[PDB]
Design a protein around this ligand. Sequence first.
Ligand SMILES: *[C@@H]1O[C@H](CO)[C@@H](O)[C@H](O)[C@H]1NC(C)=O
Lengths: 49, 49
Amino acid sequence: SGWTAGAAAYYVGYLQPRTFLLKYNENGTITDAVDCALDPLSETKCTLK
Amino acid sequence: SNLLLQYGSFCTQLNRALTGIAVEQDKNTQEVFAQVKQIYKTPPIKDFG
Ligand SMILES: *[C@@H]1O[C@H](CO)[C@@H](O)[C@H](O)[C@H]1NC(C)=O
């Protein structure tokens, strides 16, 4: 009982097998991505690349 | 599907060709039938000699 907790937080999510469209910029960094088959608009973005 | 993922370019060009065909069909109907911009009506009287 003789203790106290410092202020911190953590968040847990779970991975699933997904298709992603990653955008590598001119410096080789992934700056943005599209989660494919999230919503139909994302599917359109996938097909159009 | 995961194995097919690497043929996305082939399938995209397939669907591009088919979409072009569909737009072409709509355009064909538009050019054949929508030449006149105004919807004329027949007169109530049919005194056409
Ligand atoms: C890429 O690296 C160069 C450093 O030479 C920097 O000037 C540039 O801002 C970087 N590009 C981006 C999109 O951050």
